[PDB]
Amino acid sequence: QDSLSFGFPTFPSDQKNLIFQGDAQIKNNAVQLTKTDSNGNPVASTVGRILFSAQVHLWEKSSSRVANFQSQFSFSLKSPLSNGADGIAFFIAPPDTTIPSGSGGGLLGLFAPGTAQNTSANQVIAVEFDTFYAQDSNTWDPNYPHIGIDVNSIRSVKTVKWDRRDGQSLNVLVTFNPSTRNLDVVATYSDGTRYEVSYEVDVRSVLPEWVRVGFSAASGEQYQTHTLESWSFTSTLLYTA
Amino acid sequence: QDSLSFGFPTFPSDQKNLIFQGDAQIKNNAVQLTKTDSNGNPVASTVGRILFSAQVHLWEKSSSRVANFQSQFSFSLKSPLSNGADGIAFFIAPPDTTIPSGSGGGLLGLFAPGTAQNTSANQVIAVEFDTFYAQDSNTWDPNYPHIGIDVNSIRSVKTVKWDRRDGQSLNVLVTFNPSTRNLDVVATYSDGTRYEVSYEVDVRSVLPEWVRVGFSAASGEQYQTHTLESWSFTSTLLYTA
Numbered sequence: 001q002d003s004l005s006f007g008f009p010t011f012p013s014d015q016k017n018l019i020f021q022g023d024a025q026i027k028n029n030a031v032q033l034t035k036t037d038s039n040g041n042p043v044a045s046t047v048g049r050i051l052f053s054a055q056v057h058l059w060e061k062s063s064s065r066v067a068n069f070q071s072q073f074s075f076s077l078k079s080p081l082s083n084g085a086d087g088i089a090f091f092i093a094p095p096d097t098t099i100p101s102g103s104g105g106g107l108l109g110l111f112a113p114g115t116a117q118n119t120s121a122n123q124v125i126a127v128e129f130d131t132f133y134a135q136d137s138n139t140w141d142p143n144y145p146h147i148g149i150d151v152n153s154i155r156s157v158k159t160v161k162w163d164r165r166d167g168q169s170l171n172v173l174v175t176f177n178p179s180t181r182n183l184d185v186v187a188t189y190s191d192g193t194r195y196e197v198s199y200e201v202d203v204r205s206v207l208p209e210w211v212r213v214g215f216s217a218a219s220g221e222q223y224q225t226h227t228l229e230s231w232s233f234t235s236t237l238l239y240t241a
Numbered sequence: 242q243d244s245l246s247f248g249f250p251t252f253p254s255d256q257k258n259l260i261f262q263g264d265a266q267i268k269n270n271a272v273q274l275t276k277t278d279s280n281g282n283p284v285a286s287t288v289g290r291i292l293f294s295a296q297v298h299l300w301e302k303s304s305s306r307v308a309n310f311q312s313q314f315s316f317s318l319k320s321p322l323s324n325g326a327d328g329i330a331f332f333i334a335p336p337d338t339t340i341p342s343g344s345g346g347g348l349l350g351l352f353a354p355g356t357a358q359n360t361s362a363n364q365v366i367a368v369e370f371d372t373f374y375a376q377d378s379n380t381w382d383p384n385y386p387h388i389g390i391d392v393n394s395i396r397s398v399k400t401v402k403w404d405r406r407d408g409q410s411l412n413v414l415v416t417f418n419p420s421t422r423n424l425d426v427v428a429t430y431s432d433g434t435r436y437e438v439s440y441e442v443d444v445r446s447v448l449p450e451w452v453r454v455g456f457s458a459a460s461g462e463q464y465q466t467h468t469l470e471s472w473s474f475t476s477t478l479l480y481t482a
């Protein structure tokens with residue numbers, strides 16, 4: 001299809017079009033990306049991701065078209081600790097993507113240790129909401145919580161300082177304009193606090209024509225729940241000249 | 242997802258989200274449901290169907306909601322014979338639906354011979370464009386080409402007279418309103434000729450909560466091509482009160 005869209009206002013337990021990887025699962029009409037105990041408390045050493053089953057036609061060589069897409073979603077993080085880790089990320093990657101070996105903790109379940117910073121060894125674009133930046137383990141991170149755009153590397157090509165609020169839902173809008181090649185991110189808390197970050201990227205030189213979209217989250221030594229509450233997505237192939 | 246939609250203005254050969262069954266395949270940016278030779282000419286004894294891979298949430302018991310959906314599509318039929326057969330149908334059925342054994346010819350690849358007219362043995366709703374009605378073989382058909390609404394049986398719950406035009410595209414709009422429970426069908430040729438037919442049906446007593454949508458076509462002794470040229474679909478769960 002040239003166009004595709006879907007919307008999950010909530011996440012009822014009987015899902016049919018979601019690919020669950022790692023510890024991801026549905027609980028209380030929301031997606032708990034990371035593992036929790038019987039009491040609903042976050043645990044350490046856990047990774048989880050979800051992908052929509054239908055593949056997205058991001059670009060088409062024969063027609064020289066590139067898709068214009070928008071992803072809207074909300075999530076919340078909760079943790080008895082004040083150093084919650086490690087973060088949640090919206091990502092786009094080849095359809096057969098799986099959790100790389102040893103991609104836990106600060107690698108957010110998206111990159112392999114040995115090539116986490118090798119841009120020519122990866123095929124992924126992601127928008128991370130990173131809450132852990134200890135310079136000893138996350139050497140690639142700026143020294144403060146942040147939202148970043150990742151293009152084939154765990155070291156963001158661009159970031160903006162961000163504030164983690166325990167238990168509060170963050171509303172996010174991610175848009176890609178093929179005409180300008182700008183990937184824009186806008187995140188806001190219910191009180192109006194707003195954060196923005198953008199970057200110009202030619203998706204054609206990074207990802208294949210067909211991809212899958214989803215979310216990933218992970219907790220290493222430090223932990224917190226990564227609860228995905230809602231999500232809607234839409235993409236349309238457009239002639240851009 | 243509570244809502245889902247997709248659009249195929251045309252059908253390029255590299256598809257990822259279509260399930261092809263039988264002889265269906267892509268040729269010249271269109272879906273040829275029935276088999277054709279090297280010259281693109283129709284042949285006898287062929288059946289083929291396609292289904293969109295993502296499952297559609299038709300209704301939800303827990304929330305008492307039922308989907309509002311619309312399917313717009315166009316096709317063309319072509320044959321050197323004076324009596325091209327057998328027809329093409331848009332249908333909705335359980336996710337695991339496959340071509341029934343011996344469902345060729347007048348059964349349109351939708352029903353098995355032994356239970357073709359047993360409404361309690363089937364789970365399918367289809368809109369057929371039936372071009373073959375010989376009273377000696379298709380005993381269940383009215384005596385003329387027609388558009389029919391099928392509910393668990395090859396013997397339409399309703400039919401209206403229709404004209405077959407060789408090589409001319411027919412545009413069709415199929416909609417379902419959960420509020421009135423009306424399944425409406427509107428078909429037109431490029432010169433303005435119009436056909437309409439509707440039927441009241443509670444989809445909840447006929448189909449499971451999750452289903453797949455697609456098209457089916459077949460040719461028995463007589464033949465013709467069944468070319469699907471375009472298709473767009475959309476559905477959204479709504480509270481029915």
Ligand SMILES: CO[C@H]1O[C@H](CO)[C@@H](O[C@H]2O[C@H](CO)[C@@H](O)[C@H](O)[C@@H]2O)[C@H](O)[C@@H]1O
Binds near residue numbers: 086107
């Ligand atoms: C000195 O490193 C120790 O402590 C690190 C952080 O406490 C730890 O890193 C793990 O946990 C963090 C936070 O969850 C995560 O970002 C890392 O990727 C890693 O999983 C080290 O392993 C040591 O214990």
Ligand SMILES: CO[C@H]1O[C@H](CO)[C@@H](O[C@H]2O[C@H](CO)[C@@H](O)[C@H](O)[C@@H]2O)[C@H](O)[C@@H]1O
Binds near residue numbers: 326461462
């Ligand atoms: C009396 O029946 C004979 O002729 C029928 C029509 O030619 C034929 O039926 C087959 O073909 C029709 C048309 O394609 C189709 O509707 C039937 O389902 C069947 O496949 C009979 O087989 C006999 O030859």
Ligand SMILES: [Ca+2]
Binds near residue numbers: 087133141
């Ligand atoms: Ca980090």
Ligand SMILES: [Ca+2]
Binds near residue numbers: 379
């Ligand atoms: Ca018939």
Ligand SMILES: [Mn+2]
Binds near residue numbers: 128142156
């Ligand atoms: Mn980071």
Ligand SMILES: [Mn+2]
Binds near residue numbers: 371381383389395397
């Ligand atoms: Mn009929």
